[PDB]
Amino acid sequence: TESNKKFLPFQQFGRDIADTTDAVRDPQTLEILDITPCSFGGVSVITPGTNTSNQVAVLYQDVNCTEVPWRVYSTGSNVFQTRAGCLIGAEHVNNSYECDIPIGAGICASYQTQTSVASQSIIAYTMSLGAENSVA
């Protein structure tokens, strides 16, 4: 990409702590390109007990869901973005419950078995800390 770091005359590459190569100068046209390796979030599988089902959801770590394309299919507009990362395979429910599977950033997932809509669904949602109850 294009960087704004002002470039000294003849020094070529810009580094950081990591001894890697952070910035460069295009030798042909002296322009100061920034080098930012595109993010690689670790894939994390979200599943109920396989004794129950075989449809599961995939949680990527914090990445731009745009970067997400061995995936079989991407759920259409139901890719639910958390503060933790993109999650494909779960409809963003608002009906809060107590949560079994930790997803992070307050988000928890769980299996849901409906009568009509997705009798085998794997939902993710904002966890309820409990049944709120104030005493008089």
Next chain:
Amino acid sequence: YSNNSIAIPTNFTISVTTEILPVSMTKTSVDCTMYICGDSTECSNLLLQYGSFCTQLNRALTGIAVEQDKNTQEVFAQVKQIYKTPPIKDFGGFNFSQILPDPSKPSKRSFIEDLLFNKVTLICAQKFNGLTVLPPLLTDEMIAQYTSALLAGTITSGWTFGAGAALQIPFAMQMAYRFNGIGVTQNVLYENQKLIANQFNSAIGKIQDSLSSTASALGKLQDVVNQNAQALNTLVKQLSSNFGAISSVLNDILSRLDPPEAEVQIDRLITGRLQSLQTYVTQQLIRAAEIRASANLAATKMSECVLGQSKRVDFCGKGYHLMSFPQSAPHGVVFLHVTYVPAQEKNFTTAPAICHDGKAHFPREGVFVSNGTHWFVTQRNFYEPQIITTDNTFVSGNCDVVIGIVNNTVYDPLQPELDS
């Protein structure tokens, strides 16, 4: 010290004492092959043919992470249901706006913990080197709401919600129970309600101030965060070494060397970086066990001080203890202990017992003090004069076995009621 000298205190003070506990650290993770090598195909083969080290490291780091999560869960877990603050504040005159959360923020934080949030608290470089950071499941908001429910229950129900169902009971009777727990009878609290209210609210204001003026008391959380961050930056800077090998960049040396000699040079470089990663993860395990120790300590406090009253001393702050209001902090928890402390001391001459009618007399609850003229029974932790009635005594034996006894009269509460 003398065989008849006692000093019963007469004026007390509630005092606020903060306590700091590193309940968790930043959940950390290091993709094994990713840090060692930037996904080069030769590193793939070499690290594969090396062993199952990197999978070991992934398992250990995920264990650290899930254990930190268990810590954060259990340290606040003692909440069956999220109680909520009653709207009005008729707490006998105890201004709780600083400790309790109010809808000033869209978040349910409190005015005090904002100083924490702001005072205790380059990752772009680490984010590209495999060295990532996961987020904590219990977010700041839900941690804050757990602290809110904890404080709400602690105010409205004393300890019944720790044991069973939450039970309404006003703050007056709660302080009365706690004073009874630390010896001082309810009479002092209900005679000095307004005075103790002023003392309590003033102390809360003074601790708010003392935190607002400097960020040096909130020490240990900063030290934990710095230890973690320095470990991470050491782990990154470690990449820059050469270990005798050609250069600190794989993709570089892959150009200079054919597969054969690249094999041995990268053998050396990988042995180096991998020994370093092992060192890092070992120190991380050790600090994680230390944090879990301090977290079990925090849990013992939160389930002993907060949800009850520790008869035992110096486990909930200096002095006789009453209760403790917890508050969240970035990767930490702070307690506001409100501890009873006697302040003003008057000398008195004491008697271990009393001879009234040839038989011995012993104080059933208090101590026999005097100023020379009258003898009185008093509560062992707050000066309270009382005439010597048989209600405060239980006769036992005679006037011989006792050592240091004094002669006196013990008034009988029936004489006028016997005259008629």
Next chain:
Amino acid sequence: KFNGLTVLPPLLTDEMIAQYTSALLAGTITSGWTFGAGAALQIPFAMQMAYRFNGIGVTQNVLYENQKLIANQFNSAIGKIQDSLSSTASALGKLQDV
């Protein structure tokens, strides 16, 4: 010491440590249990032990029933403790282990 690995000095000397322990002991004896909570209070040791008896579950009067007797056992207790140490070395075994 000729190969770098010196032993750093322990911060608190044996003198000040023994002084701290003497402070703890004095506060326990005379001031009762208050000195760790607030300000120290002169208060008779016999009555202090009586309060502790009331603590464990026996009524304080018992102490005054047998005051001298107690001390005897107490003092004789101390006695054995003394000889309990000089007799066998492995009675003190943790510190030596460390």
Next chain:
Amino acid sequence: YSNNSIAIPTNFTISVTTEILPVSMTKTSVDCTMYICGDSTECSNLLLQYGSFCTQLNRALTGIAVEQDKNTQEVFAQVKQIYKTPPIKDFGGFNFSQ
């Protein structure tokens, strides 16, 4: 045991016992490069060719040292003010000179 037969103690005892505990392991410090390199010219450079170990080990050991310090200063220095024992020792039988 039986449904109506209690036991009660009549005479009692005191048995002073010892409970030893460690506080501070000998706070050691190992020089990073004096041990490894025999203070030479090429070896020291070959050492600093390795990573930031010289700081790593020494830093962890300094952490051990400061933790030993805090241990010694927290397990003992809970007293507020160093107390002096009284001039006379009248405890009604509690000889304390040991």
Next chain:
Amino acid sequence: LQSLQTYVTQQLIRAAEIRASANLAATKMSECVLGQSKRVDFCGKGYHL
């Protein structure tokens, strides 16, 4: 380096162990001395004074 490193790791582990024992001693000192802990077989065999 490998030898010194295993030494440092074992020393830090034993240091954490001593730290745990020191906190235990802190609790004992602040309960068996600064007060009277009713907890049986925390201070010592039998009721504690």
Next chain:
Amino acid sequence: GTHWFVTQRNFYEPQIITTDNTFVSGNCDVVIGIVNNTVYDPLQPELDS
């Protein structure tokens, strides 16, 4: 609504306020939220004898 009862903080056990399990300290203004009722006294019958 009718009879005050003293009861421990755990299990409901009604108790008309005998002056045996009650004690006095001071006057009736320093306290807060106090209520008016005659504390029962046991010493009336056998004094009537």
